[PDB]
Amino acid sequence: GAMNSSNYAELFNNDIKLFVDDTNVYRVTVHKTFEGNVATKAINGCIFTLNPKTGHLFLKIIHTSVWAGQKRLSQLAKWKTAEEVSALVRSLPKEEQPKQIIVTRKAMLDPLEVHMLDFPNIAIRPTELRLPFSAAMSIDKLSDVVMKATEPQMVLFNIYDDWLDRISSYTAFSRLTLLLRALKTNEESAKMILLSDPTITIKSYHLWPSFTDEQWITIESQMRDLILTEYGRKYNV
Amino acid sequence: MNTVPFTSAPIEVTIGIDQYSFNVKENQPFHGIKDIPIGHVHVIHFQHADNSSMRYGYWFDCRMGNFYIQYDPKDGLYKMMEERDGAKFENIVHNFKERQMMVSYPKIDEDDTWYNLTEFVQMDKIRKIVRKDENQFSYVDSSMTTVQENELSDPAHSLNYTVINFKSREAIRPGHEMEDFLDKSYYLNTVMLQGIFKNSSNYFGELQFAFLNAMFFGNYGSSLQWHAMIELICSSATVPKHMLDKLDEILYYQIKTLPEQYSDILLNERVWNICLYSSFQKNSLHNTEKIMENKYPELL
Numbered sequence: 001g002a003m004n005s006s007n008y009a010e011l012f013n014n015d016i017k018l019f020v021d022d023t024n025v026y027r028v029t030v031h032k033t034f035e036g037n038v039a040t041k042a043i044n045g046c047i048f049t050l051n052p053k054t055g056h057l058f059l060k061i062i063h064t065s066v067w068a069g070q071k072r073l074s075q076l077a078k079w080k081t082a083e084e085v086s087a088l089v090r091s092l093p094k095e096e097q098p099k100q101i102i103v104t105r106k107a108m109l110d111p112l113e114v115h116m117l118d119f120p121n122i123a124i125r126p127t128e129l130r131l132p133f134s135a136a137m138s139i140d141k142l143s144d145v146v147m148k149a150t151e152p153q154m155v156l157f158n159i160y161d162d163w164l165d166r167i168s169s170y171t172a173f174s175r176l177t178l179l180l181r182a183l184k185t186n187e188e189s190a191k192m193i194l195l196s197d198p199t200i201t202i203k204s205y206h207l208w209p210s211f212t213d214e215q216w217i218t219i220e221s222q223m224r225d226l227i228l229t230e231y232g233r234k235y236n237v
Numbered sequence: 238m239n240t241v242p243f244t245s246a247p248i249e250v251t252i253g254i255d256q257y258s259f260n261v262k263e264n265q266p267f268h269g270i271k272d273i274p275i276g277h278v279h280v281i282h283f284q285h286a287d288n289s290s291m292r293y294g295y296w297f298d299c300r301m302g303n304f305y306i307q308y309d310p311k312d313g314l315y316k317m318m319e320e321r322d323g324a325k326f327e328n329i330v331h332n333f334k335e336r337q338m339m340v341s342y343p344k345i346d347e348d349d350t351w352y353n354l355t356e357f358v359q360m361d362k363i364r365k366i367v368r369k370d371e372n373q374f375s376y377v378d379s380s381m382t383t384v385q386e387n388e389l390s391d392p393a394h395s396l397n398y399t400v401i402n403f404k405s406r407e408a409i410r411p412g413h414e415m416e417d418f419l420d421k422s423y424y425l426n427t428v429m430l431q432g433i434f435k436n437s438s439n440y441f442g443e444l445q446f447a448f449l450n451a452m453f454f455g456n457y458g459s460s461l462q463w464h465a466m467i468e469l470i471c472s473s474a475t476v477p478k479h480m481l482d483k484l485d486e487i488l489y490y491q492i493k494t495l496p497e498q499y500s501d502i503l504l505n506e507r508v509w510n511i512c513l514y515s516s517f518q519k520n521s522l523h524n525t526e527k528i529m530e531n532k533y534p535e536l537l
């Protein structure tokens with residue numbers, strides 16, 4: 001069934017599963033034509049396919065050429081996403097294929113279900129959680145590789161850097177979702193918190209800074225404050 | 238004109254013949270139904286006055302033999318049987334006509350309703366959906382399940398309708414995933430019409446039989462099958478113009494004959510709002526759209 005606060009720990013059990021988010025697949029700037037009409041111009045996007053237990057991120061870059069001469073692109077994007085996720089699964093060894101795929105938006109269910117008909121035993125599930133994965137393009141190295149791509153490309157990351165050497169998957173996912181929720185609600189302030197102290201760096205092979213355990217507690221607290229604030233600023237509380 | 242007679246009516250029952258029905262009291266002197274139009278299938282159906290659980294009945298074609306009904310006190314139902322002796326049957330039948338113990342199949346001559354509801358329904362196709370080959374006629378009741386229902390339990394008693402499944406390998410060509418899911422023309426035209434049904438007449442015969450079983454017996458699986466067959470056409474961009482015209486007439490007479498008080502249950506909102514207003518054929522069902530709007534604007 002659907003994934004929610006009640007069955008939340010199921011994410012970190014030993015059944016392989018992937019989250020699929022499609023909110024950055026079809027990206028456009030909306031601008032004016034010389035005639036004063038409005039036109040869109042696409043930019044590169046990406047599918048965000050994430051193993052929440054291991055941190056492994058399959059970032060499929062969606063190059064603007066895929067949209068050339070196509071109609072109803074918002075609908076196409078969902079089917080393109082499902083085609084690429086199906087292709088990913090087929091590329092994995094059998095023992096690496098997921099038993100469940102959880103889509104972050106319910107409109108991906110039928111597209112993915114239809115592309116996965118060859119995999120009757122892989123459950124396609126929605127979720128009632130409002131996950132902040134749209135903010136993945138606020139992570140500088142992920143945004144840089146998408147915008148620079150000149151062709152379709154799959155890039156692999158561990159979205160948890162080396163955190164699993166010191167914390168559990170549950171704690172790592174909570175940290176990730178807090179960071180992403182902050183970047184989503186006020187990207188500029190979130191980035192200021194992360195990169196303020198000149199002494200803490202991002203390793204070349206990592207996405208986030210090299211915080212000690214104590215610094216991570218301070219960072220996490222500062223991110224909570226930002227989120228509550230904006231919730232006040234937004235709601236006037 | 239042909240006759241489906243009865244040995245007697247030992248229990249109070251409402252007896253239907255096609256779209257007609259009459260009440261018969263316990264041990265009332267009822268010996269059957271005469272003047273039944275030759276040329277069409279028919280259905281004779283029953284609802285006991287004391288246990289409205291189980292509507293049941295029999296599809297038959299008077300051309301395929303002489304068929305009568307006797308109440309079985311052990312199994313508790315009116316059973317159809319096929320006599321193999323002529324003369325005695327006609328002589329008792331003459332006598333039955335002579336004592337005027339029979340109701341007349343009461344067809345208004347202006348009225349084409351039954352033809353229009355059974356236009357493509359043939360006993361041969363009924364007998365393949367309802368498997369019981371030692372009888373020329375076919376029993377159906379409210380509770381029988383379909384093959385597809387059983388997949389998701391007694392096979393001998395199943396309705397073997399053609400399985401339609403829009404998220405299935407049969408329906409979706411590898412590499413045309415989006416194309417085939419949003420435009421079912423290849424499932425309709427190549428898979429089902431050319432491949433399984435062979436022609437649109439056999440497609441329409443099954444659609445019509447499914448509707449009739451849903452209406453007369455409350456058969457839930459038949460209602461699902463009726464709507465699935467409609468949806469496959471309404472969700473295809475490419476349908477022969479003659480099928481679209483005929484489908485409009487088919488559905489018109491089904492919606493016309495449906496009791497007004499049964500619309501809540503036998504009609505599926507999603508299928509009809511898609512077929513009439515959102516689908517490829519939203520503009521090709523003028524007569525069906527007109528009666529649904531004047532008779533069931535609530536559902537829409």
Ligand SMILES: CC[C@H]1CCCCN1C(=O)CSCC#N
Nearest residue numbers: 242243244305306320325326329
């Ligand atoms: C259906 C009316 C006739 C002819 C068909 C076979 C059985 N019939 C009966 O009436 C059953 S008691 C009279 C005797 N025998």
